Structures are given as C-alpha cells and as structure tokens.
C-alpha cells in the first residue's frame, strides 16, 4: 500500500478516500474529498484558498527548509530487502517525527512572537 497526498489541499489520501481524475494529457489528479474535487472542477486556486498546504507554504505558515523534511521523499530506485535496514529506518522515523514536532513548535512560536 501507500499513503497518497491530495493534489488540492495536501491532506493524507488513504485508500478508498477520494476521486481520481485522469486528464487526456496523461496526468492523474488524486483528491481526498468531494470538497477538493468540486473546488478543482470549479477551477479555484489552492494557492489562494487559505485552508490548503499550498497557500500555507506560499505564505510561510510552515517550515519548508529543514533536514527533517529532506529525509523523506519519493524513491524511484529500489533497495534490496534488509531487516536491519527497515528496523533502523522505523526507529529513525520515530526520531524524525518527534524532532519535527519540536521544530514546528519553535517555528510557530517564532511566528507568534
């Protein structure tokens, strides 16, 4: 399986949740809700709607430059299975998640200073 991201708002798109739009140019449009789908169909800008990660990143409401976000990205080159690698990766994921939480707390404190 895999956790998808909504094209419009960026909330986690889980299996079953949402409608996928296949445009004739060949690119897929995955949405997490009917709200997002209808907004896309009425052709509004997620960069303008304030409840979207696009808007928040554009307006600098979230931290975007940090190793805790450079550590995770889509992988197009597979790695051979290795139990130590996956277990150590899981522990690293826990560490990264709590470090991210603390950094985001500091960021929002600095924004609300």
């Amino acid at each position: 399986m895999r956790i998808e991201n909504c094209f419009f708002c960026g909330r986690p798109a889980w299996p079953s949740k949402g409608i996928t739009f296949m445009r004739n140019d060949g690119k897929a449009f995955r949405f997490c809700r009917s709200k997002c789908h209808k907004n896309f169909k009425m052709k509004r800008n997620p960069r303008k709607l304030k409840w979207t990660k696009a808007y928040r990143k554009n307006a600098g409401k979230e931290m975007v430059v940090d190793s805790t976000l450079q550590f995770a990205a889509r992988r197009n080159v597979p790695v051979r299975y290795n139990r130590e690698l996956w277990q150590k990766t899981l522990k690293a994921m826990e560490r990264i998640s709590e470090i991210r939480a603390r950094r985001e707390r500091v960021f929002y404190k600095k924004r609300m200073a």
């Binding site: 399986m1 895999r2 956790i3 051979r80 299975y81 290795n82 139990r83 996956w86 899981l90 994921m93």
Partner: protein, 55 residues
C-alpha cells in the same frame, strides 16, 4: 546455454517444471505460487518476512 540440455517431454530424468509442480500440488486454479521463492537476499532466512509499509 551451450552447456544446457534440450528439454523433451519423454526423458525419464527431465527437469521438474512448474506445470508438473502445480499439477502435483493441485491444478491451474488451486495451486498457490510462492512469489518469494526466487528472492535473492543477503540472509536466506529473511524471505517470507512481512515488510513494514506504514508507520
């Protein structure tokens, strides 16, 4: 390939073959194939392991 022996259906000690394996272990709609039997990993015991996907 040039060190091989050509397959024939009548030779007593031929190759086992997946058709014969599934015919022995059921049929075409009953045999369940092990997709991890040919997995070439570092430690051979790491086969048949449930790889985490979501955390």
């Amino acid at each position: 390939v040039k060190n091989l022996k050509k397959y024939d259906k009548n030779d007593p000690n031929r190759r086992v073959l997946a058709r014969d394996i599934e015919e022995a272990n059921g049929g075409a709609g009953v045999f369940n194939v092990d997709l991890r039997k040919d997995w070439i990993l570092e430690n051979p015991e790491w086969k048949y392991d449930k790889i985490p996907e979501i955390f």
